[PDB]
Structure formats: C-alpha cells, structure tokens
Design a protein around this motif. Structure first.
Motif, mmCIF file in Angstrom:
data_model
loop_
_atom_site.group_PDB
_atom_site.id
_atom_site.type_symbol
_atom_site.label_atom_id
_atom_site.label_comp_id
_atom_site.label_asym_id
_atom_site.label_seq_id
_atom_site.Cartn_x
_atom_site.Cartn_y
_atom_site.Cartn_z
ATOM 1 N N UNK A 14 0.829 -1.194 0.000
ATOM 2 C CA UNK A 14 0.000 0.000 0.000
ATOM 3 C C UNK A 14 0.868 1.249 0.000
ATOM 4 N N UNK A 15 0.434 2.247 -0.750
ATOM 5 C CA UNK A 15 1.043 3.560 -0.702
ATOM 6 C C UNK A 15 0.358 4.409 0.368
ATOM 7 N N UNK A 73 0.188 7.226 -7.664
ATOM 8 C CA UNK A 73 0.984 7.045 -6.466
ATOM 9 C C UNK A 73 1.392 5.584 -6.390
ATOM 10 N N UNK A 74 2.642 5.336 -6.013
ATOM 11 C CA UNK A 74 3.067 3.952 -5.859
ATOM 12 C C UNK A 74 4.018 3.810 -4.681
ATOM 13 N N UNK A 75 4.081 2.595 -4.154
ATOM 14 C CA UNK A 75 4.969 2.268 -3.053
ATOM 15 C C UNK A 75 6.210 1.583 -3.611
ATOM 16 N N UNK A 76 7.385 1.987 -3.145
ATOM 17 C CA UNK A 76 8.608 1.357 -3.633
ATOM 18 C C UNK A 76 9.648 1.337 -2.526
ATOM 19 N N UNK A 136 5.329 -0.709 -12.756
ATOM 20 C CA UNK A 136 4.620 -0.693 -11.486
ATOM 21 C C UNK A 136 3.133 -0.427 -11.660
ATOM 22 N N UNK A 137 2.341 -1.117 -10.851
ATOM 23 C CA UNK A 137 0.956 -0.739 -10.649
ATOM 24 C C UNK A 137 0.916 0.603 -9.935
ATOM 25 N N UNK A 138 0.047 1.479 -10.400
ATOM 26 C CA UNK A 138 -0.079 2.810 -9.830
ATOM 27 C C UNK A 138 -1.516 3.009 -9.379
ATOM 28 N N UNK A 139 -1.695 3.516 -8.160
ATOM 29 C CA UNK A 139 -3.003 3.970 -7.705
ATOM 30 C C UNK A 139 -3.241 5.413 -8.130
ATOM 31 N N UNK A 184 -4.115 3.978 3.671
ATOM 32 C CA UNK A 184 -3.272 3.644 2.534
ATOM 33 C C UNK A 184 -4.118 3.571 1.286
ATOM 34 N N UNK A 185 -3.445 3.512 0.143
ATOM 35 C CA UNK A 185 -4.146 3.434 -1.126
ATOM 36 C C UNK A 185 -3.499 2.341 -1.965
ATOM 37 N N UNK A 186 -4.321 1.539 -2.641
ATOM 38 C CA UNK A 186 -3.724 0.544 -3.522
ATOM 39 C C UNK A 186 -4.603 0.331 -4.735
#
Lengths: 294, 298
Positions: free
Chosen positions: A3-4, A122-125, B2-5, B122-124
């Motif tokens: 999750x971001x 938005x992305x988590x990395x 990457x997957x992006x929200x 969080x966001x996904x």
C-alpha cells in the motif's frame, strides 16, 4: 498488498517549474519551491553542465512557477547541492507538517508521480541496495517526490532527477544530495548489480507466519556466517547483527528464532515455491520493511 | 512496470466515521449525505437473519453518530438504497469533488482508499476479479472504504467494501448498494467461486512488455479466437471475445503485433513456461492491468 500512503497532503504541494524550454515538477513548502537544478539546463548543457555558471546568469523572472492556475512570483533563488530552492512571495496555505529525512537502502516510501505539476499516480517502492528506484517515471516526472507519512507528518526522502539506461531511476534527498554514486550529468553512469533486501524478505516471512502460513518452515538452523555464505550466492544482501536485532520483536511474537527463519529462507532459495504462495505472492517479496510488517 | 493507484486526495477529504450502537465503520460524505454499508445498523445477533426494513424503522436520527475528524455531523434524515445506508447530515462537505457513481465490470481496475474508523490509512490499485471479489487488505475495520477511478477532476466511485470472505478476499457493492457477485450482507456461509485469469488484461500486459523492449516471447505464428479459447479454458483463463480484441486494437496498431498473434505468444507461454526468462522482470503473467491502464501508463 503493498500500500502507498494517502497522497493528499503531498498533492497540495506540487507545482510546475519552467526555465526556458524545460518544465518539470517542484515541491512548494511554505515560501520555498524545491526542484532539480537541471531545470536550468538545455539538452546540450547536460553533457558537461557548469551549474554555478548557468545559475549566476538567471534572474528571478526567468523561473515560471505555476500552482494550478495561479502563477507564483519568484523573489529569490539559491542552489543547495543538486536542488534549486526558489523563494516565492506566497507561503503555501496547504503546507502539511513535514520534515526532510535521508533514507538508507532497504527503506520503503511512496512516490507521487507527477507530470508538469499535476499528480498522475501514487506507488509504493523501496530504495534498492544499488541506490536506484524501480519506478514508473514518465518522461517529465523529474521533481516528483517520495515520502512517508507518520501521524500526519510527511517525511520527504526522495526527489526524482535522472533515468538510468536500465530503465531505473536515480535522485536526491531534499537537501539535494544524490543517493548513490550518481550525478545530474548525462554520463555513462549505470546502476550496479542489484541485490535482494534480505532483512525485508525475512520480515515478510515473519508476516506470513503471523498470518498463519507455515509450510516453508523446516527443522534446521544456521549460523549467521553460513547463512550469509549461501545467500550471497543468490545475490542477497548480507544479513548483519543489526538486522538480526531488528527482527527480534517479530521473532518473539512468532516464537521462531531469527536464524531458524534464515534456515527457512536458505531452503526456499534452494527449492523455490513448488507452486505454493506466501501471502498471495509466488515471489520472495523484499519491499516490506520490519517496521512495515509490525 | 509498477501498478499505480490514483492520487487519493480528492477522496481523503470525504471519509468520515459512522457509529450506530456498538458498531463503527467508514462512511463517504458527499455534499450533505453520508453513504455507508447498511449493516452498520445490525447487532451481532441481528446479523444471522436481518430484516433491514424493520431494523431501520426502529432507528432514529439520534441513533447515528457521524464524525468528520474532530467534528460531529448531526444526522437529520436516514434512508436505505439497496445495501447502502444514506444519512442526511446538517452540513454539506465543502471538500466534495466532482464525482459520479458508476458500476464496473469484472476485470476492470480501480484504486481503494483503505480507512480505519474514518481515517485513511493507505491506497492501492486492484482489479475486480471474474468471481466478483477483490484481493485486497481490509483492514481490519475497513468496511465502508471505497474504490474509485479519476478522470480529469471527476471521481468515479465504483466500490464500497462490505465484508471479508472466508478465503480472505473482499466483497462489496457499488455506491447505489448493488452487490458485486452472489453475496449478501448477512452472517451466513458464503464463498468465492473459482476464479479465473483475466485474459484481456494479460494480453495488455504483454503489449506493455513489448512497448518496454521485452520481445523474446513474440513468435511468427497466429491463432484463431476459437482455437485460443480452448487453450484458455484448459488453463483457467477467461474466454476472449471480439470486443476484447477490439479493445486491444490501439495496442496492436502501436506495436505491430496483431491480437491473435499475441494470443499465439500467450498460448505458447501457457504450455511451455518462460524457460528461465522473465517478462517485465516478472516470471508470472500479470492480469491486473487493463488495456486502458497500459495506454495511460505508456
């Protein structure tokens, strides 16, 4: 799921910065806009840029800063390492509580990818051990930032500067110091061989045990040195005594000693998955930190 | 790749906490209405066989506690629309975005803003599975979290979270209260059907690989829609339709690989594997990017 962080607090800080023919993203916090100093470069300049000579020739009015539909007036500028700091005549009314932090490889954060000041996704990395990011950086995403949010305080840790030939991304902290050996110059620089973040894999395995998956455990243990000798043959980062200490809480919570989980990891590298999944992944995941798992 | 929200800011400003009795969950505050799952009015005892029409007649406005951060909103009316409770409140949300309520199809993707007690966590990015469930993380205490897409400045709300299924996946409704999938908001035994792979999304992801320079899986061959669908059925893949092939048209024009040529690539991968190679640095076939997602990101 990776999750971001909710991105709203950072969206309110993104602006567009144009200098000459180049436009990129800036970060508007209080009365300062932060952006990559290569906004003052042409494509020719990027081979051998002399940033001090390029910047002395600029006036405030050479910098066009747009926050949505409003032009912000630049009233001063300075360069701190590789970041340009544009003083504007208006403090951002949407400035969240924030701080600047420099992170270490293995640490995770969210990136708000932006195009010409406009948030796109938005992305988590994670910061890779070779100091690069495997990101989704559209051509004009320079100046997009990475951040964590802890109790409504945004900690900014990354600003995007450069794309490397292997498709990965390089950048700086918000004090303008690059992560890794990279420079804001078009040189032959290349990401070194990347490695798996071992402590993150082990934290994740502990999460799996916590979530009730035990199939990958075994009856073996290992010494720290024997684990490292094996794991390095798979391009895994060495595990340090600090890393063992960091997993201590998760060890106590699941009753599985850290070196016993290391033994499990060694066997997973030797055997693969045999069709099974761990927390819904067919891959050993290394972008969850021990802080993240807790 | 990457997957992006989607950026979640426009939705964060709409999340509130709804409490009825002992039960607290998340609600969505748009103008002067708060939307949340109707099972918020249910006791643990009523959940076995609830009569929502009767249970809501017996409730009054004073039974509902709505909190927007540090501000209590006063409820001045209540009604149900299918499985969604609608609480009219004394104040319009000044942060209400331009928005629409939409219903999505299996295989389509959206972003979820996971919330705890009205507080976004969080966001996904996820996809609606063919069996109408979501593989997400909810949360615990995530009921009432919403899923959405953003187009220009318009938020299209498509999902509200209602329940976790025994396999750990998630089930919910559109914002008009219609469930996705054969599920009910009652404490009974229910299970996700057998899931399949979203074939049109796998093909989009292969076009993305070629756009990114990964070309080893391309071959000289073409297949038929008929012949491919028999290989798909044997591998638990959704059948491919002419509308699917038409949706992939933009990618086939941009890359020069016709869809049934990519299908031959896919059929070969499904029978022989990757032979130690990867696609977009991955060794499994990803099916949670839509053709629209790949165009938007490429």
């Amino acid at each position: 799921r990776k999750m971001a962080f909710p991105s709203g607090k950072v969206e309110g800080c993104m602006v567009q910065v144009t200098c000459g023919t180049t436009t990129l993203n800036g970060l508007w916090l209080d009365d300062v806009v932060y952006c990559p100093r290569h906004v003052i470069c042409t494509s020719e300049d990027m081979l051998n840029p002399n940033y001090e000579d390029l910047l002395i020739r600029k006036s405030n009015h050479n910098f066009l800063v747009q926050a949505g539909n409003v032009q912000l007036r630049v009233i001063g500028h300075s360069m701190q390492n590789c970041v340009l700091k544009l003083k504007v005549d208006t403090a951002n009314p949407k400035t969240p509580k924030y701080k600047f932090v420099r992170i270490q490889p293995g640490q995770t954060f969210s990136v708000l990818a932006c195009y010409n000041g406009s948030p796109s996704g938005v992305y988590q990395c994670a910061m890779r051990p070779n100091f690069t990011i495997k990101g989704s950086f559209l051509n004009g995403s320079c100046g997009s930032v990475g951040f964590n949010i802890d109790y409504d305080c945004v900690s900014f840790c990354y600003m995007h500067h450069m794309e490397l030939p292997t498709g990965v991304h390089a950048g700086t902290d918000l004090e303008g110091n690059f992560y890794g050996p990279f420079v804001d110059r078009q040189t032959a620089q290349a990401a070194g061989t990347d490695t798996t973040i071992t402590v993150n894999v082990l934290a994740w395995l502990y999460a799996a045990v916590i979530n009730g998956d035990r199939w990958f455990l075994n009856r073996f243990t290992t010494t720290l040195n024997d684990f490292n000798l094996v794991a390095m043959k798979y391009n895994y980062e060495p595990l340090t005594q600090d890393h063992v200490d960091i997993l201590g809480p998760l060890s106590a919570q699941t009753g599985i000693a850290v070196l016993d989980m290391c033994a499990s990891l060694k066997e997973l590298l030797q055997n693969g998955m045999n069709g099974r999944t761990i927390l819904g992944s067919a891959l050993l995941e290394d972008e969850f930190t021990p802080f993240d798992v807790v």
